[PDB]
Amino acid sequence: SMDAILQDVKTTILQTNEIERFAVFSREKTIRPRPYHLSHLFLDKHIEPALSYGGDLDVTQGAQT
Amino acid sequence: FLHLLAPHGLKGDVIRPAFGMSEISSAVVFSFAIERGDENSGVLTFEETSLTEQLRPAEARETGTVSFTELGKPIPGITIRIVNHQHELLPEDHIGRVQIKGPTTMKGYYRNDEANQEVFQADGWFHTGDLGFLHEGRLTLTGREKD
Amino acid sequence: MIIINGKNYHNYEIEAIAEEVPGVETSFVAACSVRMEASASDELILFFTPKLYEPAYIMRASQHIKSHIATKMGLSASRIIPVQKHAFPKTSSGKIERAQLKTRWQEGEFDEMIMEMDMRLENEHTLPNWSYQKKWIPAPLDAADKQIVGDVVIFADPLGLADQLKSFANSEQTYITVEPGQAFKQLTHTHFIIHPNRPSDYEQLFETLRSYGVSVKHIIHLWNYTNQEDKLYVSKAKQAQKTGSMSALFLTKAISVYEEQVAITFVSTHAMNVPEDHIHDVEKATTAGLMTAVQHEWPFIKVQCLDFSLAESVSSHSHAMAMMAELTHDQDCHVAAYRQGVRYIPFLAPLHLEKEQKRKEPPFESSGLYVITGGLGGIGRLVSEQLLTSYQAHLVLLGRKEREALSSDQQETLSLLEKQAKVHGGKVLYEKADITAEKEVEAIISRHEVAGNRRLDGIIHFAGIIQEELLADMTSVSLNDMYEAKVYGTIALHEAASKRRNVLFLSSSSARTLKGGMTVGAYCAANEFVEQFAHYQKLTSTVKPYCFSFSMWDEIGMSEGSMIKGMLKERGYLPISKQAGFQTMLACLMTDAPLIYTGLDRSKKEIHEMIHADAEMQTEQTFYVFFKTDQTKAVEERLYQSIHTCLQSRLSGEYAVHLFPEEYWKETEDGSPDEAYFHELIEES
Ligand SMILES: [Ca+2]
Numbered sequence: 001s002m003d004a005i006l007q008d009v010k011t012t013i014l015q016t017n018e019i020e021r022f023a024v025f026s027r028e029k030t031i032r033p034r035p036y037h038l039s040h041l042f043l044d045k046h047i048e049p050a051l052s053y054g055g056d057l058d059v060t061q062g063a064q065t
Numbered sequence: 066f067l068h069l070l071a072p073h074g075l076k077g078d079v080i081r082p083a084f085g086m087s088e089i090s091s092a093v094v095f096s097f098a099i100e101r102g103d104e105n106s107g108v109l110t111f112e113e114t115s116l117t118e119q120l121r122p123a124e125a126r127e128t129g130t131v132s133f134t135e136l137g138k139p140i141p142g143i144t145i146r147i148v149n150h151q152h153e154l155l156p157e158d159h160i161g162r163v164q165i166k167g168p169t170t171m172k173g174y175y176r177n178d179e180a181n182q183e184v185f186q187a188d189g190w191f192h193t194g195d196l197g198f199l200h201e202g203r204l205t206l207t208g209r210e211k212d
Numbered sequence: 213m214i215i216i217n218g219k220n221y222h223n224y225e226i227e228a229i230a231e232e233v234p235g236v237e238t239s240f241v242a243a244c245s246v247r248m249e250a251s252a253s254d255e256l257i258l259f260f261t262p263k264l265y266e267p268a269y270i271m272r273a274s275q276h277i278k279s280h281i282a283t284k285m286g287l288s289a290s291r292i293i294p295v296q297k298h299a300f301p302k303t304s305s306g307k308i309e310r311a312q313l314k315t316r317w318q319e320g321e322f323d324e325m326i327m328e329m330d331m332r333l334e335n336e337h338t339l340p341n342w343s344y345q346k347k348w349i350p351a352p353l354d355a356a357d358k359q360i361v362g363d364v365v366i367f368a369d370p371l372g373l374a375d376q377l378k379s380f381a382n383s384e385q386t387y388i389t390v391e392p393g394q395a396f397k398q399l400t401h402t403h404f405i406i407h408p409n410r411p412s413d414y415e416q417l418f419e420t421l422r423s424y425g426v427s428v429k430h431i432i433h434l435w436n437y438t439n440q441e442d443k444l445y446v447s448k449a450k451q452a453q454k455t456g457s458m459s460a461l462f463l464t465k466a467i468s469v470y471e472e473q474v475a476i477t478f479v480s481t482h483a484m485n486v487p488e489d490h491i492h493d494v495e496k497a498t499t500a501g502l503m504t505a506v507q508h509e510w511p512f513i514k515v516q517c518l519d520f521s522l523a524e525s526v527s528s529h530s531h532a533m534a535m536m537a538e539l540t541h542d543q544d545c546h547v548a549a550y551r552q553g554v555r556y557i558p559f560l561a562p563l564h565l566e567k568e569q570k571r572k573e574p575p576f577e578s579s580g581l582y583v584i585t586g587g588l589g590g591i592g593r594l595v596s597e598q599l600l601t602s603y604q605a606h607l608v609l610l611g612r613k614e615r616e617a618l619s620s621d622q623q624e625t626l627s628l629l630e631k632q633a634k635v636h637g638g639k640v641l642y643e644k645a646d647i648t649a650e651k652e653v654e655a656i657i658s659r660h661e662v663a664g665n666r667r668l669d670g671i672i673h674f675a676g677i678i679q680e681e682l683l684a685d686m687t688s689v690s691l692n693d694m695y696e697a698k699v700y701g702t703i704a705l706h707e708a709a710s711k712r713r714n715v716l717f718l719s720s721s722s723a724r725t726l727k728g729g730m731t732v733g734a735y736c737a738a739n740e741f742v743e744q745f746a747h748y749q750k751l752t753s754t755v756k757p758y759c760f761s762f763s764m765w766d767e768i769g770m771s772e773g774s775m776i777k778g779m780l781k782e783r784g785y786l787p788i789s790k791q792a793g794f795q796t797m798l799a800c801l802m803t804d805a806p807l808i809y810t811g812l813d814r815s816k817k818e819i820h821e822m823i824h825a826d827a828e829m830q831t832e833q834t835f836y837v838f839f840k841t842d843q844t845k846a847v848e849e850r851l852y853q854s855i856h857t858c859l860q861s862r863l864s865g866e867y868a869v870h871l872f873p874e875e876y877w878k879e880t881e882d883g884s885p886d887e888a889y890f891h892e893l894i895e896e897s
Contacts, residue, residue: 022837036340037338
């Protein structure tokens with residue numbers, strides 16, 4: 001019944017006339033549970049110097065020239 | 066120097082580091098903690114790995130660390146900072162271009178304008194070109210540009 | 213024009229290059245930019261429409277575009293947001309209403325599928341579904357025409373179960389009964405006395421039995437088949453070990469050297485906490501937890517533990533009757549529990565954090581008093597950093613050494629926390645203390661309860677050493693060095709939390725306890741207690757516990773010098789990063805589940821056999837189709853729906869159609885489909 005399905009899919013691929021040659025094969029695989037999305041569990045808000053001064057200098061004391 | 070001349074009466078902390086240019090009218094920082102007995106006083110050792118990031122202090126090693134002598138705090142009357150390659154202020158421990166401002170800054174190069182555009186970019190903050198960090202509020206030079 | 217740090221690009225080129233990518237509908241592409249609140253640069257947001265609106269086709273092209281931009285233009289697209297054709301906004305004049313899409317996206321029409329994309333790639337928003345609970349499920353026994361054929365040793369109980377079991381013995385077998393006492397004393401050739409805690413008396417027992425010609429083929433250990441005591445100090449914990457979990461060590465060590473097959477059978481009362489049971493002598497759990505490592509280290513020693521309840525039941529299924537049945541019947545599962553004359557075995561069941569959620573944010577109070585053990589450990593810091601930044605908590609860290617004697621690696625990771633606390637308004641102290649002393653704990657807590665006028669808000673108990681050591685070399689102190697933190701310490705901390713109301717209790721364990729492990733008897737023995745303890749607290753006291761038993765840590769190193777400990781991954785124990793795990797803890801903390809196993813791949817067999825045991829895994833058939841059309845009428849959508857309609861209600865399983873563009877189809881010369889190129893693609897997928 002498995003390859004019987006494969007055959008009835010090819011005939012379904014021929015239902016569309018715009019396609020004139022194709023190829024189809026199947027695979028069996030194990031599922032890995034879908035992860036969560038952080039938005040679904042968590043709340044929104046959780047998801048989200050070098051400058052030295054030497055000290056003032058009194059420049060107005062003493063010779064200005 | 067100190068150990069070889071000590072028997073002749075030179076005291077251990079006489080030495081006085083200072084970083085000054087011609088454009089700034091000479092020294093702008095002074096280090097007083099340079100003792101004979103204490104080779105680490107005024108001397109900062111860091112890991113070579115952290116030179117690009119936050120400097121990580123390290124121990125005296127022959128291959129793997131670097132020692133920088135502290136020049137000291139800016140002089141009474143001026144302010145010093147350091148900037149990144151985009152001319153933004155840097156964090157405490159990151160290395161950057163030393164930039165100095167105060168009343169000791171020259172008028173400007175005589176008959177040379179584009180040189181003025183490089184040195185004091187904006188607000189008279191002078192680009193020394195010397196690369197160094199400013200830790201604890203006391204400047205510590207790392208290396209001059211292209212030297 | 214759109215700009216990115218360093219250069220700017222014309223959106224006509226971006227969209228034009230993206231239209232080369234197979235599956236991109238021509239002229240339905242958009243390029244924008246936005247500076248997130250980081251403002252460090254401008255990121256490229258990119259919209260497009262696929263010739264098929266189904267995530268397989270989309271995810272296929274989203275990657276192909278993101279890379280094709282990095283190849284041809286030198287940059288990668290931050291996000292790529294798919295949008296159906298019938299809702300792609302354009303003006304009558306063919307202009308692409310770009311600024312509308314951005315504003316339409318910040319509102320989140322495309323959230324619905326930008327999530328479905330995040331899920332399929334297990335993105336930073338993935339939060340894998342890998343957490344389960346232990347659920348006690350009924351499993352009866354099969355009919356058994358086999359009978360016991362051997363001489364049996366039996367460490368007799370004081371309640372009379374031993375007496376019952378002897379009456380069933382066949383006429384050919386001799387039953388050697390052993391009682392506990394002050395030291396070795398042989399009363400008869402079939403009656404003995406030994407000091408349960410002295411290992412010599414065990415090997416001497418068997419040695420003198422080898423002489424008398426008794427071939428020991430079965431051992432029964434009814435020594436933690438006790439009657440209930442309600443007080444639970446630490447002494448009672450230390451003391452019950454020697455009559456129980458330690459005894460099991462010595463007994464197995466002794467009979468292991470003869471290297472002869474033998475059927476040991478431990479028997480407990482109130483060691484396992486199932487639903488509807490009002491008594492829980494949890495101190496007995498280490499016994500059953502240590503023996504997990506036996507069948508791995510000494511394959512010739514079959515082991516199975518049983519737990520019964522003395523909650524009054526007028527011999528509805530006499531303990532003796534069940535006892536015999538389990539002995540004759542092919543030892544299958546390690547542990548089982550008879551409660552009301554009903555055999556139960558422990559199975560796993562997924563947590564389903566969303567559907568079981570009972571709370572929207574972690575249950576930590578803002579500036580609450582929280583005491584932490586081994587907060588300087590890799591997993592402790594994660595929790596300490598959190599309780600100091602996000603919450604501004606008064607933390608007191610308890611270590612066993614003194615501050616000055618800490619690892620230079622630790623003293624730093626503490627100063628970090630001291631600084632990281634000063635700048636977040638929290639406080640963090642450290643105190644040398646004996647985690648094991650009931651009174652020394654209440655004294656040290658009370659002090660911190662008055663400094664800040666807050667009552668204790670929670671205990672986080674991650675302290676623990678690991679020693680990989682085999683039952684062969686396992687000294688009696690090896691265990692008592694293990695129990696110090698994970699048992700005797702745990703009991704002292706709970707001694708305080710029980711005197712307050714609704715205190716939070718966090719506990720770390722391991723999933724090795726599920727199936728057992730070689731050279732980890734000490735680990736499994738203690739962790740089987742910490743896990744079973746959470747249930748003791750929910751039954752005894754106000755405390756609200758959360759116990760995470762993790763599969764693996766990246767703290768054991770991804771290299772480890774033994775990448776064959778990763779082989780344990782191959783049986784279904786994933787490595788979990790700090791963030792991945794830490795995030796899990798929070799998610800679970802929002803669910804009231806008190807015990808939770810995390811890091812388990814329900815795909816791999818060992819785990820799958822723990823959730824179902826009998827039903828086979830579930831397969832999903834995935835069809836792959838390839839294209840070659842006469843005209844250019846995009847039939848993808850018309851075709852997908854055509855195949856999906858042929859499969860409707862006709863497979864009896866889980867199916868999915870996966871479609872490929874036209875411009876992947878290839879043909880070998882001589883007029884045949886290039887099947888080599890297809891079977892190659894399906895795997896690279
Ligand atoms: Ca195209």
